[PDB]
């Protein structure tokens, strides 16, 4: 047996310097005499800078270092569904091992510019504001950005739960969270039934920095296996900011030149290389897709910072959450004024487009007149008419926790709001009106729901108006 070897010079902070290892490749895995793995990142004249993928307390200066000759790979397969794993692919929930028969490189090429097809089919999140104003399609990359405790995790959990009946496979990647939060999320998914099609990849806070650095790539590598078989996959990256912090820690420990805010120069390259792997494959390549929901956590609402700007410039659209809206009762706190979605329209069914066309304009007018609303009712009649319409729009867009709504019911309630049928209901009764309207549509008018569900178009205008009037004949005001 033969193996090219090296000698450790320096150990500390999760970084090891090795003398020797002449023929090691950049990015190759390397194992120590202790039996722990490491990844070689700095290839210098007389030393090799090694990042350690495990506990470094057992490594001492002078120990043997050996080449492996393999680029990092992660296990993939159907068996990963319903399991909780670490970025190396090992299960952490118990329940026995995982029987996977294939492996994929953790770093692989993205689909080419000629492999893709334009995004044309919607991803139903069940959040009315998202589905009506910031549409998300299959193959899109959507950024969810906001301060701490604004509902970012809740949006992702609601989406993953809502994918129950659609033919989608969801992957949740947790970076930097304490394992109690991850276990609670797994319990919530198990309770709501989402673990039957979900893979959870976790990199806890106590784990070494390289694992947090590699976790999103492991998740996307697990996802691409299903993507290239023709399936549809949804991937959620819980904190690209924590990933970037870990990468900055590693770069500073390896003594690479620092940029702004001490970040390395390739911090944008890292995230772009990660995010560009989400794509919509053409019908020649199978027709599968992978859609991504990266997360970014800001401080004091500063969206001009380095990582927020870098991630904003990559994604197709962004969703902004604000504590101002969160505590004023407007939750979920999507700021529809600032949120954008370039893949809008194509990511919506025809009925949703028809009803949201007016909703956008109404909210735009209400946002303008909200500045003059501070002067009471001393306003021209049309102005407070538009204010009354805007208040009902805001009340309609409100939604509680873990209550996904079918798209047909969303389009029906939006149509009712936008055609003027709600102009006589008091603002304090809009939520109850919608709640009773859903039960009324369940009991009667199933034909409208079936028509929307089958033909993806609005039902006959006369029938819908008659049904709404019949319901209003039964609604009772407070």
């Amino acid at each position: 047996q033969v193996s090219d070897v090296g000698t450790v010079i320096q150990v500390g902070d999760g970084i090891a310097r090795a003398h020797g290892l002449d023929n090691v490749m950049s990015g190759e895995l390397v194992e120590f005499a202790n039996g722990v793995m490491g990844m070689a990142l700095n290839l210098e004249e007389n030393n090799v800078g090694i990042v350690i993928l495990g506990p470094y307390t057992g490594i001492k200066e002078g120990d043997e270092v050996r080449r492996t000759g393999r680029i990092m790979e992660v296990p993939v397969g159907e068996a990963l569904i319903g399991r909780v794993v670490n970025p190396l692919g090992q299960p952490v929930d118990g329940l026995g091992p995982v029987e996977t028969t294939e492996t994929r490189p953790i770093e692989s090429p993205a689909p080419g510019v000629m492999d893709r097809r334009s995004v044309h089919e919607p991803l139903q999140t069940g959040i009315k504001a998202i589905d009506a104003l910031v549409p998300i399609g299959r193959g899109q990359r959507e950024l969810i950005i906001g301060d701490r405790q604004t509902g970012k995790t809740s949006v992702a959990i609601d989406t993953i739960i809502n994918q129950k009946d659609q033919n989608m496979i969801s992957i949740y990647v947790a970076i930097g969270q304490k394992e109690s939060t991850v276990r609670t999320v797994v319990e919530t998914l198990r309770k709501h039934g989402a673990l039957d099609y979900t893979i959870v990849v976790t990199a806890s806070a106590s784990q070494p920095a390289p694992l947090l650095f590699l976790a999103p790539y492991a998740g996307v590598a697990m996802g691409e296996y299903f993507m290239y078989k023709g399936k549809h996959v949804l991937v959620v990256y819980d904190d690209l900011s924590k990933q970037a912090a870990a990468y900055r820690e590693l770069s500073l420990l390896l003594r690479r030149p620092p940029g702004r805010e001490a970040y390395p120069g390739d911090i944008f390259y890292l995230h772009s290389r990660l995010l560009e792997r989400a794509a919509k494959l053409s019908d020649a390549k199978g027709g599968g897709s992978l859609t991504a929901l990266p997360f970014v956590e800001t401080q004091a609402g500063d969206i001009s910072a380095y990582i927020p700007t870098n991630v904003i410039s990559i994604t197709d659209g962004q969703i902004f959450l604000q504590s101002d809206l969160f505590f004023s009762g407007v939750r979920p706190a999507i700021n529809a004024g600032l949120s954008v979605s370039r893949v809008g329209g194509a990511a919506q069914i025809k009925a949703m487009k028809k009803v949201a066309g007016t909703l956008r304009l109404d909210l735009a007018a209400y946002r303008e007149l909200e500045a003059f609303a501070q002067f009471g009712s001393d306003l021209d009649k049309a102005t407070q008419a538009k204010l009354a319409r805007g208040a009902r729009t805001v009340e309609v867009l409100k939604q509680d926790l873990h209550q996904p709504i079918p798209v047909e019911k969303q389009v029906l309630i939006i149509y009712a709001l936008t055609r003027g049928f709600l102009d006589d209901i008091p603002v304090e009764d809009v939520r109850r009106f919608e709640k009773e309207f859903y039960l009324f549509l369940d009991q009667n008018g199933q034909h409208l729901l079936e028509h929307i569900r089958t033909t993806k178009d609005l039902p006959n205008e006369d029938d819908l108006n008659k049904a709404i009037e019949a319901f209003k004949k039964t609604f009772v005001v407070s």
Binding site: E179, A205, A245, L252, L253
Partner: protein, 471 residues
Amino acid sequence: MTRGRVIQVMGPVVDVKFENGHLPAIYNALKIQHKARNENEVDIDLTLEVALHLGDDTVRTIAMASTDGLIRGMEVIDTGAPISVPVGEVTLGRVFNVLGEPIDLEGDIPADARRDPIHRPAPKFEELATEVEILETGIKVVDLLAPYIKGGKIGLFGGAGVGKTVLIQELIHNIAQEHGGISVFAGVGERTREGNDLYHEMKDSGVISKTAMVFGQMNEPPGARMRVALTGLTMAEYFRDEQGQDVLLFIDNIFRFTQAGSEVSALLGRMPSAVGYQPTLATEMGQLQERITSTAKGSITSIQAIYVPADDYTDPAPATTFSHLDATTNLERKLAEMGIYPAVDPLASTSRALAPEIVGEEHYQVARKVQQTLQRYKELQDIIAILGMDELSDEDKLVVHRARRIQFFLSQNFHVAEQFTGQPGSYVPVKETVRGFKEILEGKYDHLPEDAFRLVGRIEEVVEKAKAMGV
């Protein structure tokens, strides 16, 4: 051979050179003992902890005390293991330093007593156990807008002089007197006066018979300030694991740990990160925080005070520790200055237990309505300042009227604050808080003056104070 030699002394950092092939492992404890050979030297009795391997048979360490008197050429002893502290039943009712040596003048621990290494890996995903139970504290703000979780992790943020120490003392007085388990207090970077006063208070109250106390204060070097918290956590972990007992863990200021780490980081050769902190800020804090958890075999509920430097909540140390907590309360200098204690920010504070199926529908609705009213009052503050109170609409004036009374009624009189004022203090049940806030929201007490609501307990005390005022 375990004999080394001192090479460099630079403040709290010492470099030791050993024989080739016998370097001590990282985190090992080294002993420097030396007796003066002539009149130009002083005695030394010092403990060092290994930090890095520099190559060329040299190890860079961190001192657990002052390095005055060190001379290049002293002999160093390798003990072959990390710091070990006495642990178990012998630790109840005693006060220890960072090295595990009692400082209460009650004698020395027997040399055969069990000792446990300071450094260990954190518990695992399959070992963790989760469940939400409201921890009643008797404080209106905490019980209403950010309930505490039994077996959870609670952090108390606040600037300099806002009241987090007083809140710690009130929580001890309200919970520790009947908890029924073991209590552990670890004072990091705080006042020796506070430590002495708390020790005498616990002796008076009798809680000391079931409490272990570890002290490393602001006079200590960063070496000790970085390890006192780990000593206390190691003591608590034995009661969690080997006995399956409920543990109250109090940490006086966890920020001083990262502050000491940043002080010592520059001398270790690391490049400085943003705003001068160490590159390893997140990993070092995570390796400590993830050990403080409740597992299947035992539960740990921990209350931490987290100092906020220069009232900057965006500072990396406060910003990183947010993700490690289940319930937080953010103290504010603005509220402290107006005189409404405990000066908790009613909107910045959040808790994982504020859900309809955990606290109840009525409680949830009342809390959300209070938060909405306070947010509206916060938004009206520019138009009120500029255009004046007269030009606000009918509803805005009512919102302001309810909001000021709510903000005042959130204040409370504490048992421990009777040293500053003659008012004896009170303990308010959650039912009373919810009913009182509901009554205020329904507009029942709009006819009372604003000042009647300051520093009282239940809602009936407001009526009593108003009647004293003459109503």
